[PDB]
Amino acid sequence: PPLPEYGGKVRYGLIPEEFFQFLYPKTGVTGPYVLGTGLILYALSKEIYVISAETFTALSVLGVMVYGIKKYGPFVADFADKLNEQKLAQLEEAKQASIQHIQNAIDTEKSQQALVQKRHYLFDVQRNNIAMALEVTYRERLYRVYKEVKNRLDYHISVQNMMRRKEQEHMINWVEKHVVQSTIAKCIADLKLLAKKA
Amino acid sequence: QKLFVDKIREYKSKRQTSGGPVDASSEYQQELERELFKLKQMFGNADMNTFPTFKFEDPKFEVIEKP
Amino acid sequence: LALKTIDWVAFAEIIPQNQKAIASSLKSWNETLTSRLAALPENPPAIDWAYYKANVAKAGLVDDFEKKFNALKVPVPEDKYTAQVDAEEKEDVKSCAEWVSLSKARIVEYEKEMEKMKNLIPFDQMTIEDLNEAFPETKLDKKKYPYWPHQPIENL
């Protein structure tokens, strides 16, 4: 339940405004003051209020009280209001802090769900590596078989080739060795053509 | 053509090599084995004349699942 | 080979701190196997017997060498490994989906609490018991401190 905002509009700290309004319609604006004057003067004049040392004790206390409220009243009012404003602000900030905490928890949870949704890459990576290893090994095997058969066939052709080469070399050096083992007809025909050289 | 007549006879003496692998060498094999040594060992280290039998290995594999 | 294209940072986020080394080694083998499938081609260049018919002076040896090749049964390695990582992925998806259902429960609970905190009574119209049910931390420990002020005097 919310409090009202203002109090009851007392006057001189001793008489509520309800009284002045209640006596307005029948005795104007000066009716209450005339009544107060009359009652004060009647109490004095008839010794209902005996003037004594308590008159001056009361005057001094009332003076100190009026001076006190008039001088240190603004400060106490503002102090109470600031106390309330500080408690209110602290509570509001605690509220916003709890709101932010639970929003951060929700966000964190949605992020974790995104991560756990991304999980499948570990297993498709493992499948990638298995497939790639099997294919590399297959092609390496086909290259091995190819390269072995080709190496054997080209070894055959190379031994035949260099055999033919060395055999032809011995052949040629035999045919030279054989002219050493062995008629000036061409000699004269050579000089005959040398004469036609002129 | 004296020397062209000359030559023909010498290639014929050469072609007379039915039983002669290297035409009356009496040598030149002692190094040809060295040559053939190099040639065979540098093509491979096996009975190249015969077909190669093929042994094949299979890839290793490990514990991959989440430990 | 029909491969699965992969993000690598995404692969990084989903790796627990007890197997980064295994992930990186798995990663390193992916790169090596990508490279080695790149350079060696798919099928060997077969060779005509012609250059091996007219220069192999041996008795029909080229033909059986080539016959033993056209008739060779090269062993194709089988998988024996993809089905079980599929099974592990299936088992893992079970674990993953159930953990998500727990988190969806927590998320609706948090929204309930945030609707509760968002609809609090204004603070200037509120008993102390109303505060103690909003922020229950502000409730006096009348168990340990049974006598007034029900808290340590320094706290006051």
Curated annotation (Swiss-Prot), chain A:
Residues with the modification N6-acetyllysine, per the entry, are: K95, K110, K118, K177, K192
Report the residues modified as N6-succinyllysine. Answer: K87
Question: From which domain of life does this come?
Answer: Eukaryota
**Subcellular localization(s) per the UniProt record:** Mitochondrion; Mitochondrion inner membrane
Q: Name one GO biological process term.
A: proton motive force-driven ATP synthesis
Task: Quote the cellular component terms of the Gene Ontology held in the record.
Answer: membrane; mitochondrial inner membrane; mitochondrial matrix; mitochondrion; nucleus; proton-transporting ATP synthase complex
| Subunit-structure text | Component of the ATP synthase complex composed at least of ATP5F1A/subunit alpha, ATP5F1B/subunit beta, ATP5MC1/subunit c (homooctomer), MT-ATP6/subunit a, MT-ATP8/subunit 8, ATP5ME/subunit e, ATP5MF/subunit f, ATP5MG/subunit g, ATP5MK/subunit k, ATP5MJ/subunit j, ATP5F1C/subunit gamma, ATP5F1D/subunit delta, ATP5F1E/subunit epsilon, ATP5PF/subunit F6, ATP5PB/subunit b, ATP5PD/subunit d, ATP5PO/subunit OSCP.
Its annotated function is as follows: Subunit b, of the mitochondrial membrane ATP synthase complex (F(1)F(0) ATP synthase or Complex V) that produces ATP from ADP in the presence of a proton gradient across the membrane which is generated by electron transport complexes of the respiratory chain. ATP synthase complex consist of a soluble F(1) head domain - the catalytic core - and a membrane F(1) domain - the membrane proton channel. These two domains are linked by a central stalk rotating inside the F(1) region and a stationary peripheral stalk.
Family to which the UniProt record says this protein belongs = Belongs to the eukaryotic ATPase B chain family.
* Name the record gives this protein: ATP synthase peripheral stalk subunit b, mitochondrial
Swiss-Prot record, chain B:
Q: Any one cellular component term from GO for this entry? A: mitochondrial inner membrane
Q: Does the keyword Magnesium apply?
A: no
Residues bearing Phosphoserine are S26
GO biological process terms on file: proton motive force-driven ATP synthesis; proton motive force-driven mitochondrial ATP synthesis; substantia nigra development
Location comes to: Mitochondrion; Mitochondrion inner membrane
- Which branch of life, at top level? Eukaryota
Modified sites of kind N6-acetyllysine: K2, K7, K40, K55, K60, K66
| Keywords (A to Z) from UniProt | Acetylation, CF(0), Hydrogen ion transport, Ion transport, Membrane, Mitochondrion, Mitochondrion inner membrane, Phosphoprotein, Transit peptide, Transport
Q: State the Gene Ontology terms under molecular function.
A: proton transmembrane transporter activity
Question: N6-succinyllysine is carried by which residues?
Answer: K55, K60
Summary of subunit composition and partner proteins: Component of the ATP synthase complex composed at least of ATP5F1A/subunit alpha, ATP5F1B/subunit beta, ATP5MC1/subunit c (homooctomer), MT-ATP6/subunit a, MT-ATP8/subunit 8, ATP5ME/subunit e, ATP5MF/subunit f, ATP5MG/subunit g, ATP5MK/subunit k, ATP5MJ/subunit j, ATP5F1C/subunit gamma, ATP5F1D/subunit delta, ATP5F1E/subunit epsilon, ATP5PF/subunit F6, ATP5PB/subunit b, ATP5PD/subunit d, ATP5PO/subunit OSCP.
| Purpose | Subunit F6, of the mitochondrial membrane ATP synthase complex (F(1)F(0) ATP synthase or Complex V) that produces ATP from ADP in the presence of a proton gradient across the membrane which is generated by electron transport complexes of the respiratory chain. ATP synthase complex consist of a soluble F(1) head domain - the catalytic core - and a membrane F(1) domain - the membrane proton channel. These two domains are linked by a central stalk rotating inside the F(1) region and a stationary peripheral stalk.
Q: Which protein family is it in? A: Belongs to the eukaryotic ATPase subunit F6 family.
What is the name of the protein in this document?
ATP synthase peripheral stalk subunit F6, mitochondrial
UniProtKB/Swiss-Prot annotation, chain C:
The record's Gene Ontology cellular component field reads:
mitochondrial inner membrane; mitochondrion; proton-transporting ATP synthase complex
Example of a GO MF term: proton transmembrane transporter activity
Superkingdom field:
Eukaryota
Instruction: Supply the alphabetized keyword list.
Output: Acetylation, CF(0), Hydrogen ion transport, Ion transport, Membrane, Mitochondrion, Mitochondrion inner membrane, Transport
Which Pfam families does the record match to this protein? Mt_ATP-synt_D
Compartments it resides in: Mitochondrion; Mitochondrion inner membrane
List residues, modification N6-acetyllysine: K27, K58, K67, K73, K80, K90, K112, K139, K144
Give the UniProt record's GO annotations in the biological process aspect: proton motive force-driven ATP synthesis; proton motive force-driven mitochondrial ATP synthesis
Residues modified to N6-succinyllysine: K73, K80, K90, K139, K144
Please verify whether the record's keywords include Transit peptide: no
Describe the task this protein carries out. Subunit d, of the mitochondrial membrane ATP synthase complex (F(1)F(0) ATP synthase or Complex V) that produces ATP from ADP in the presence of a proton gradient across the membrane which is generated by electron transport complexes of the respiratory chain. ATP synthase complex consist of a soluble F(1) head domain - the catalytic core - and a membrane F(1) domain - the membrane proton channel. These two domains are linked by a central stalk rotating inside the F(1) region and a stationary peripheral stalk.
How does it associate, per the subunit comment? Component of the ATP synthase complex composed at least of ATP5F1A/subunit alpha, ATP5F1B/subunit beta, ATP5MC1/subunit c (homooctomer), MT-ATP6/subunit a, MT-ATP8/subunit 8, ATP5ME/subunit e, ATP5MF/subunit f, ATP5MG/subunit g, ATP5MK/subunit k, ATP5MJ/subunit j, ATP5F1C/subunit gamma, ATP5F1D/subunit delta, ATP5F1E/subunit epsilon, ATP5PF/subunit F6, ATP5PB/subunit b, ATP5PD/subunit d, ATP5PO/subunit OSCP.
Instruction: Please give the name of this protein.
Output: ATP synthase peripheral stalk subunit d, mitochondrial
Organism field: Homo sapiens
Show the taxonomic lineage.
Eukaryota, Metazoa, Chordata, Craniata, Vertebrata
